[PDB]
Amino acid sequence: KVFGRCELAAAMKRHGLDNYRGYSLGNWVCAAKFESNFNTQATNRNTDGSTDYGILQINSRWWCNDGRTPGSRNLCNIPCSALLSSDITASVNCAKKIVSDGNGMNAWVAWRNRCKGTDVQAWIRGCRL
Ligand code: NA
Protein backbone atom coordinates (compact mmCIF):
# COMPACT_ATOMS: atom_id res chain seq x y z
CA LYS A 1 0.00 0.00 0.00
CA VAL A 2 1.25 3.56 -0.83
CA PHE A 3 -0.05 5.72 2.09
CA GLY A 4 -1.05 9.37 1.76
CA ARG A 5 1.01 11.66 4.00
CA CYS A 6 -1.99 12.53 6.29
CA GLU A 7 -3.28 8.92 5.96
CA LEU A 8 0.02 7.58 7.42
CA ALA A 9 0.15 10.38 10.10
CA ALA A 10 -3.34 9.26 11.28
CA ALA A 11 -2.32 5.53 11.33
CA MET A 12 0.97 6.22 13.25
CA LYS A 13 -0.96 8.46 15.73
CA ARG A 14 -3.65 5.75 16.23
CA HIS A 15 -0.79 3.20 16.95
CA GLY A 16 0.76 5.55 19.61
CA LEU A 17 3.88 6.80 17.72
CA ASP A 18 3.08 10.54 18.28
CA ASN A 19 5.64 11.66 20.93
CA TYR A 20 6.79 8.01 21.49
CA ARG A 21 10.23 8.22 23.26
CA GLY A 22 9.69 12.02 22.79
CA TYR A 23 9.56 11.97 18.94
CA SER A 24 6.68 14.14 17.56
CA LEU A 25 4.47 12.62 14.79
CA GLY A 26 6.26 14.75 12.12
CA ASN A 27 9.59 12.94 12.86
CA TRP A 28 7.94 9.55 12.11
CA VAL A 29 6.19 10.77 8.90
CA CYS A 30 9.46 12.42 7.71
CA ALA A 31 11.40 9.15 8.42
CA ALA A 32 8.74 7.13 6.49
CA LYS A 33 8.88 9.58 3.53
CA PHE A 34 12.70 9.24 3.10
CA GLU A 35 12.87 5.49 4.02
CA SER A 36 9.94 4.19 1.88
CA ASN A 37 8.10 7.12 0.14
CA PHE A 38 5.16 5.83 2.30
CA ASN A 39 5.21 2.43 0.45
CA THR A 40 4.59 -0.57 2.83
CA GLN A 41 6.06 -2.90 0.13
CA ALA A 42 9.52 -1.12 -0.03
CA THR A 43 12.54 -3.49 0.26
CA ASN A 44 16.21 -2.45 -0.08
CA ARG A 45 19.35 -4.68 0.23
CA ASN A 46 22.11 -3.29 2.51
CA THR A 47 25.85 -3.75 1.68
CA ASP A 48 26.22 -6.23 4.64
CA GLY A 49 23.61 -8.47 2.87
CA SER A 50 20.81 -7.65 5.36
CA THR A 51 17.55 -6.17 3.89
CA ASP A 52 15.37 -3.23 5.03
CA TYR A 53 11.56 -3.83 4.92
CA GLY A 54 8.46 -1.62 4.84
CA ILE A 55 7.48 2.01 5.60
CA LEU A 56 10.33 2.40 8.18
CA GLN A 57 12.90 0.15 6.36
CA ILE A 58 13.42 -2.15 9.38
CA ASN A 59 16.68 -4.13 9.03
CA SER A 60 16.82 -7.99 9.04
CA ARG A 61 20.31 -7.74 10.72
CA TRP A 62 18.64 -7.17 14.18
CA TRP A 63 14.80 -6.85 14.07
CA CYS A 64 12.99 -9.38 11.77
CA ASN A 65 13.67 -12.84 10.29
CA ASP A 66 14.04 -13.14 6.48
CA GLY A 67 16.04 -16.45 6.58
CA ARG A 68 18.81 -14.97 4.36
CA THR A 69 20.75 -12.74 6.86
CA PRO A 70 23.52 -14.89 8.48
CA GLY A 71 24.30 -14.24 12.18
CA SER A 72 21.36 -11.80 12.32
CA ARG A 73 18.80 -11.51 15.18
CA ASN A 74 14.94 -11.28 15.10
CA LEU A 75 14.41 -8.97 18.13
CA CYS A 76 10.82 -7.99 16.99
CA ASN A 77 10.04 -11.76 16.71
CA ILE A 78 8.38 -11.34 13.25
CA PRO A 79 8.95 -12.51 9.69
CA CYS A 80 10.31 -9.50 7.71
CA SER A 81 7.39 -10.06 5.23
CA ALA A 82 5.01 -8.93 8.09
CA LEU A 83 6.68 -5.46 7.73
CA LEU A 84 5.28 -5.18 4.14
CA SER A 85 1.56 -5.50 5.05
CA SER A 86 -0.93 -2.64 4.26
CA ASP A 87 -1.60 -2.79 8.07
CA ILE A 88 1.39 -0.97 9.72
CA THR A 89 0.80 -2.54 13.22
CA ALA A 90 3.90 -4.84 12.97
CA SER A 91 6.12 -1.99 11.62
CA VAL A 92 5.00 0.39 14.39
CA ASN A 93 5.36 -2.26 17.18
CA CYS A 94 8.89 -3.08 15.95
CA ALA A 95 9.84 0.65 15.46
CA LYS A 96 8.88 1.23 19.18
CA LYS A 97 11.51 -1.43 20.10
CA ILE A 98 14.17 0.10 17.74
CA VAL A 99 13.70 3.73 18.92
CA SER A 100 13.93 2.45 22.57
CA ASP A 101 17.33 0.74 21.92
CA GLY A 102 19.44 3.75 23.11
CA ASN A 103 20.15 5.93 20.03
CA GLY A 104 16.51 7.09 19.53
CA MET A 105 15.66 7.85 15.87
CA ASN A 106 19.41 8.01 14.91
CA ALA A 107 18.83 4.23 14.20
CA TRP A 108 17.22 5.54 10.94
CA VAL A 109 20.22 7.04 9.06
CA ALA A 110 17.74 8.82 6.67
CA TRP A 111 16.03 10.38 9.74
CA ARG A 112 19.45 11.60 11.08
CA ASN A 113 20.56 12.89 7.62
CA ARG A 114 17.24 14.35 6.30
CA CYS A 115 14.72 14.96 9.18
CA LYS A 116 16.75 15.64 12.36
CA GLY A 117 16.76 19.35 13.28
CA THR A 118 14.37 20.25 10.37
CA ASP A 119 10.79 21.66 10.54
CA VAL A 120 9.28 18.13 10.89
CA GLN A 121 5.84 19.60 11.89
CA ALA A 122 5.53 20.56 8.14
CA TRP A 123 4.97 16.77 7.54
CA ILE A 124 1.62 16.81 9.48
CA ARG A 125 0.53 20.26 8.12
CA GLY A 126 -3.10 20.32 6.86
CA CYS A 127 -3.77 16.86 8.44
CA ARG A 128 -7.00 16.41 10.43
CA LEU A 129 -5.62 14.56 13.52
NA1 NA B 1 17.22 -11.49 11.05
Coordinates of all heavy atoms in Angstrom, one line a residue, residues 59-67 69 72-74 80, ligand 1:
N59 N 15.5 -3.4 9.5 CA 16.7 -4.1 9.0 C 16.6 -5.6 9.6 O 16.3 -5.7 10.7 CB 18.0 -3.4 9.5 CG 19.2 -3.9 8.8 OD1 19.2 -4.9 8.2 ND2 20.3 -3.1 8.9
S60 N 16.8 -6.6 8.7 CA 16.8 -8.0 9.0 C 18.1 -8.3 9.9 O 18.1 -9.5 10.4 CB 16.7 -8.9 7.8 OG 17.9 -8.7 7.0
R61 N 19.1 -7.5 10.0 CA 20.3 -7.7 10.7 C 20.0 -7.9 12.2 O 20.7 -8.8 12.8 CB 21.3 -6.6 10.5 CG 22.6 -6.7 11.3 CD 23.3 -8.0 11.3 NE 24.4 -8.2 12.2 CZ 24.3 -8.7 13.5 NH1 23.2 -9.1 14.0 NH2 25.4 -8.7 14.2
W62 N 19.0 -7.2 12.7 CA 18.6 -7.2 14.2 C 17.2 -7.5 14.5 O 16.9 -8.2 15.5 CB 19.0 -5.8 14.7 CG 20.5 -5.6 14.8 CD1 21.3 -4.8 14.0 CD2 21.4 -6.2 15.7 NE1 22.6 -4.9 14.4 CE2 22.7 -5.8 15.4 CE3 21.3 -7.2 16.7 CZ2 23.8 -6.2 16.1 CZ3 22.4 -7.6 17.4 CH2 23.6 -7.1 17.1
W63 N 16.2 -7.1 13.6 CA 14.8 -6.8 14.1 C 13.8 -7.9 13.6 O 12.8 -8.2 14.3 CB 14.4 -5.4 13.6 CG 15.4 -4.4 14.2 CD1 16.3 -3.7 13.4 CD2 15.6 -4.1 15.5 NE1 17.0 -2.9 14.3 CE2 16.7 -3.2 15.6 CE3 15.0 -4.5 16.7 CZ2 17.1 -2.7 16.8 CZ3 15.5 -4.0 17.9 CH2 16.5 -3.1 17.9
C64 N 14.0 -8.4 12.4 CA 13.0 -9.4 11.8 C 13.7 -10.6 11.2 O 14.9 -10.4 10.9 CB 12.1 -8.7 10.8 SG 12.9 -8.0 9.3
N65 N 13.0 -11.7 11.0 CA 13.7 -12.8 10.3 C 13.3 -12.8 8.8 O 12.1 -12.9 8.5 CB 13.3 -14.2 10.9 CG 13.9 -15.3 10.2 OD1 15.1 -15.4 10.0 ND2 13.1 -16.2 9.6
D66 N 14.3 -12.9 7.9 CA 14.0 -13.1 6.5 C 14.7 -14.4 6.0 O 14.6 -14.7 4.8 CB 14.4 -11.9 5.6 CG 15.9 -11.6 5.5 OD1 16.7 -12.3 6.1 OD2 16.2 -10.5 4.9
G67 N 15.4 -15.2 6.9 CA 16.0 -16.4 6.6 C 17.2 -16.3 5.6 O 17.7 -17.4 5.2
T69 N 19.8 -13.7 6.3 CA 20.8 -12.7 6.9 C 21.6 -13.4 7.9 O 21.3 -13.4 9.1 CB 20.0 -11.5 7.4 OG1 19.1 -11.1 6.4 CG2 21.0 -10.4 7.8
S72 N 22.3 -12.9 12.0 CA 21.4 -11.8 12.3 C 20.5 -12.2 13.5 O 20.5 -13.4 13.8 CB 20.5 -11.5 11.1 OG 19.5 -12.5 11.0
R73 N 19.8 -11.2 14.1 CA 18.8 -11.5 15.2 C 17.4 -11.2 14.6 O 17.3 -10.6 13.5 CB 19.1 -10.7 16.4 CG 20.5 -10.8 16.9 CD 20.8 -12.1 17.7 NE 19.9 -12.3 18.8 CZ 20.1 -11.9 20.0 NH1 21.1 -11.2 20.3 NH2 19.1 -12.1 20.9
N74 N 16.4 -11.5 15.4 CA 14.9 -11.3 15.1 C 14.3 -10.7 16.4 O 13.4 -11.4 16.9 CB 14.2 -12.6 14.6 CG 12.8 -12.4 14.4 OD1 12.2 -11.3 14.4 ND2 12.1 -13.6 14.2
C80 N 10.1 -10.8 8.3 CA 10.3 -9.5 7.7 C 9.2 -9.2 6.8 O 8.8 -8.1 6.6 CB 11.6 -9.4 7.0 SG 13.1 -9.6 8.1
Ligands
NA1 NA 17.2 -11.5 11.1

